[PDB]
Amino acid sequence: PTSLCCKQCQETEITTKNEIFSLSLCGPMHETLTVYKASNLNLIGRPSTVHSWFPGYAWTIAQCKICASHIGWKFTATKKDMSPQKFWGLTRSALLP
Ligand SMILES: O=C1CC[C@H](N2C(=O)c3ccccc3C2=O)C(=O)N1
Numbered sequence: 333p334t335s336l337c338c339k340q341c342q343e344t345e346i347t348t349k350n351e352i353f354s355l356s357l358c359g360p361m362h363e364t365l366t367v368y369k370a371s372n373l374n375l376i377g378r379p380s381t382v383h384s385w386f387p388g389y390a391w392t393i394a395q396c397k398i399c400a401s402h403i404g405w406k407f408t409a410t411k412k413d414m415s416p417q418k419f420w421g422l423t424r425s426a427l428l429p
């Protein structure tokens with residue numbers, strides 16, 4: 333009901349609408365959902381900063397633990413003075429609804 337599930341297998345809740353937050357700027361200074369918390373995702377490999385969509389963070393591939401659908405990434409801060417230190421960037425089209 334606030335629940336966002338893996339579109340491919342529909343088994344797993346990956347996150348909730350309660351966890352959604354925005355890193356995009358609202359003044360003169362979409363496709364990827366950013367949430368504080370997620371569940372039922374397996375991380376693949378090790379963090380990388382290459383081509384990072386969120387400067388200051390590294391990314392690790394995150395896939396549904398059941399069906400292995402590539403749902404998004406875990407982003408982890410490269411510096412201690414950043415907040416949050418970690419979040420999830422999820423491909424919207426990989427989630428239901
Ligand atoms: O923050 C991110 C997450 C990883 C994402 N990524 C991809 O989706 C991708 C596909 C193929 C080759 C290389 C990449 C890449 O770095 C990307 O470009 N930036």
Ligand SMILES: [Zn+2]
Nearest residue numbers: 338341396399
């Ligand atoms: Zn799945």
